[PDB]
Amino acid sequence: GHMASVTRAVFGELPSGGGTVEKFQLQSDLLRVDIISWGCTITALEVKDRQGRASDVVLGFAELEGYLQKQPYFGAVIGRVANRIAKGTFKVDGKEYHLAINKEPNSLHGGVRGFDKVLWTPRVLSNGVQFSRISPDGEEGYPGELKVWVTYTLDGGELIVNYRAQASQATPVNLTNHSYFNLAGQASPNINDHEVTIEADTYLPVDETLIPTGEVAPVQGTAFDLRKPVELGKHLQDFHLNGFDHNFCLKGSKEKHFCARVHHAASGRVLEVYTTQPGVQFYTGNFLDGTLKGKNGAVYPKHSGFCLETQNWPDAVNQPRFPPVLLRPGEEYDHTTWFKFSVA
């Protein structure tokens, strides 16, 4: 496991003199990660199997244009606030705020033009790159100027993402990454053969609009119990499930903690996740409908990829029993997530 080297190049150019998007390639002896300055998007992630054969393990696009079309957030950074906010409304310090309803009847993943769709400023580091940007007061309805730094580093088969932010005024913040994974390789048609483990005792059941009911339901006895490794398909079938799209409650301190392990026995790849976040959104790519022009002719059908968005609980801003999501001036937002790749 060696420290990565970093390379850069021009990947594309945003329409309407939007600017130049670059691509940064982080390569170690074990992995190769591709990241672009537009929405700090992870475009490619090559991992080896037992045979040392490297497969790109994330869904994505060969070109920028592909990212710009109507697509479901592929491998980008999501903010100012990940996930849903009931009624696109929340109150901060007695004041009520209103966001875009980009997902009737709610607001999702930061609004119309969220973090995944803006150009970030890159700074190359020794073993990675750091993206920075300023989300000004009012951006997407949110209060306060938010200064954000997304730092991606690579050491061996370990990709570390860290999120730092400073607000000019009290505001909610909840950043994550929406990369879709398929250990059997990006071009596989599904995730059924993946074996999953999520260290969580409780989960958040949701409502008709996909908003947490507010209940912190134990997973025992439920199809939500992923404490012991389970095979995706069997599981989903055994439980008469369509897939998942829920937030699992991590047993956390702010200290680094285990989050999940995914294993693909046929290839032998193992993905392990650690984080400082209070929850993880586990989503099975339920909404993919096979109409997207992916990489290497790949088309993406339902269940072809999964996401593990480490974050603070959805709709936290409106559910007091949830972990605090507000960032006040003077404090610092700072979370880390470790994506450790191995072979089992």
Curated annotation (Swiss-Prot):
One of its GO terms (molecular function) is carbohydrate binding. The modification N-acetylalanine is found at A4. PROSITE patterns: ALDOSE_1_EPIMERASE. Its EC number is 5.1.3.3. Changing H178A: Decreased activity by 300-fold. Disulfide bonds: none annotated. One of its GO terms (biological process) is galactose metabolic process. Changing R269G: In GALAC4; decreased protein stability. InterPro entries: Ald1_epimerase_CS, Aldose_1-epimerase, Aldose_1/G6P_1-epimerase, Gal_mutarotase_sf_dom, Galactose_mutarotase-like, GH-type_carb-bd. Keywords: Acetylation, Carbohydrate metabolism, Cytoplasm, Disease variant, Isomerase, Phosphoprotein. Pfam families: Aldose_epim. GO terms for cellular component: cytoplasm; extracellular exosome. It is found in: Cytoplasm. Changing E309A: Loss of activity. The active site is at H178 (proton donor), E309 (proton acceptor). The modification Phosphoserine is found at S16, S126. It catalyses: alpha-D-galactose = beta-D-galactose; alpha-D-glucose = beta-D-glucose. Pathway: Carbohydrate metabolism; hexose metabolism; Carbohydrate metabolism; galactose metabolism. Belongs to the aldose epimerase family. PANTHER family: ALDOSE-1-EPIMERASE, GALACTOSE MUTAROTASE. This is Galactose mutarotase. It comes from Homo sapiens (Human).
